[model samples]
Target: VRSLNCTLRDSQQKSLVMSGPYELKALHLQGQDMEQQVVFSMSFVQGEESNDKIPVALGLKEKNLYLSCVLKDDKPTLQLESVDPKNYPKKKMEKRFVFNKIEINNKLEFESAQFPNWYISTSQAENMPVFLGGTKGQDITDFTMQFVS
Candidate 1:
């Protein structure tokens, strides 16, 4: 078990604002029973208001295709999806759903937020145990992403 933290700044380069640290626990279960549970999970933490024009940053552990852009109210929204890049249509492969959003005040003050919870499970402990991503008997955690302007 490992822990990690990261901070995301705004694009304006005005103030340092980000989310607090969060732990990501990893567990393993067989059938309906819990088999293994790892404690010290990975974590991410953002810094206080530093500047305004800083691009949002994703922690080192999170590697997946997603989108980030300013919404109608100058708020930022981030979206992530599990997709098969090879099987995706070339024209529409970039499509994704908003997974998280952050609202900011006119003073540039903001708070750290979290995305919805996403999890996966499997019947067999060894055969593609869900969430980790990969083929049978192989560890596949590779994901893709993009940033929308």
Candidate 2:
């Protein structure tokens, strides 16, 4: 099994830790109107160690949700599905500022060192909005996952 580590954070700093083997599949990206972007995906694996000593399955399911982003008309928008915004105490509007499109690139890879177990999954969207001296660009990106028995 491969050893994978993920640095998880909320509005606060690095609140949770997940380490285990997983299989990442069905990864994809899409661009819409060259101005808007969106991403969605899920993960399946057994988390052996976590910051909280609670059961792994419970923690994984509880935090399971779709992560998405959109660059619309020179603005950058990030969306976290099924999460209550009120839960984050320090939420601010600046967090959703429109970004200029300097350049946007995405990569997905599976890593396995021991049992061929996969780990370390990530999705990122980077762009520069027009206000930041960037050309108007809208791109949608996304990823999906499935667990096999």
Candidate 3:
């Protein structure tokens, strides 16, 4: 297992590939189940202005089905879609799933490229599904990320 903390800045300019399964864990909520501990790969988005944006492919060990988020029923909701990396449609895919990462004091916050004011968050109800909610800091917006190779 390799620790990727503080390594993002060095790798951001290039297409950094952590091909191995990197398990992502949230602070107090989210877990190791198939649903909670998602093995996702993040690739830098295209365009000169998008260097800071990372588009995530929430896949399961290289499977075709992947997790994505969208505004459904007027709320930010998690959804699944099929993604083929070889033929990945970068332009066609909307920016709703793209996240602008913010690393502060060792914690991370993922703000939506779709909704700038909202962020990926979970409730205190125990590993519940993460939702796009208003930024409130601490348990709501702060997340602890660990990568194991």
Candidate 4:
């Protein structure tokens, strides 16, 4: 669980990514109000791994969203789905929210277990939704993590 929560700041951009940059705090959908905070309440579930990467369930704190990489808009994208990782079945969780953790230079990068070659990434611009692909070969993938209880 790593103490149940962690705030992930983008390695390249130096800002937290959860639904948005998070500094703006409470960036809502046009029609609805969703609470987005600066820190992610990460809950990593014990599961399998690929190579030396550990499988985890990454989520936002007190929110109903979980990070996932899947085929969307005809491409593999970092999409959010509403699911409880704690009670989720191992087989389905491994296929969705679970990501293989790769640590490089003390920072972490998440590669999709379901989608090969797709890593969770953020855009260069602020207030951008986290995604799986980079722009012009300049994807912000690595992240500096701060663990919180």
TM-score of each: 0.18, 0.19, 0.59, 0.72
Strongest candidate by TM-score: 4
Superposing all C-alpha atoms, what RMSD in Å does each candidate have to the true structure?
A: 17.4, 18.7, 8.7, 6.2
* lDDT of each residue in 1-149, candidate 3, tens digit only: 11121212111111112223321223232234223334454444532244344444334445554446677898875455666767553443456545666666666666766666677665554434455676564446665544545
- What root-mean-square deviation over C-alphas does model 4 reach? 6.2
- Between prediction 2 and prediction 4, the one with superior lDDT is 4
Q: Can you write out model 1's per-residue Cα lDDT over 23-121, one digit (the tens) per residue?
A: 222223334442222211122223222344211323222333322222324433332233454542222222122112222343222222222222111
For model 3, the stretches where C-alpha displacement exceeds 4 angstroms are 1-36, 47-60, 65-67, 89-93, 137-139
- Candidate lDDT (C-alpha), each: 0.25, 0.23, 0.47, 0.62
**Candidate 2, superposed: residue stretches over 4 Å from native:** 1-13, 16-60, 82-149
Clash pairs, candidate 3, are none
Q: Could you tell me the TM-score of candidate 4? A: 0.72
- List the candidates ranked by lDDT, beginning with the highest: 4, 3, 1, 2
Residue-level lDDT tens digits of model 4 in 1-149: 35257766667635543444221211223223222335565545666755657777776666666777777777887766776646543334557777877887787888887876678776666566667763426667787777666
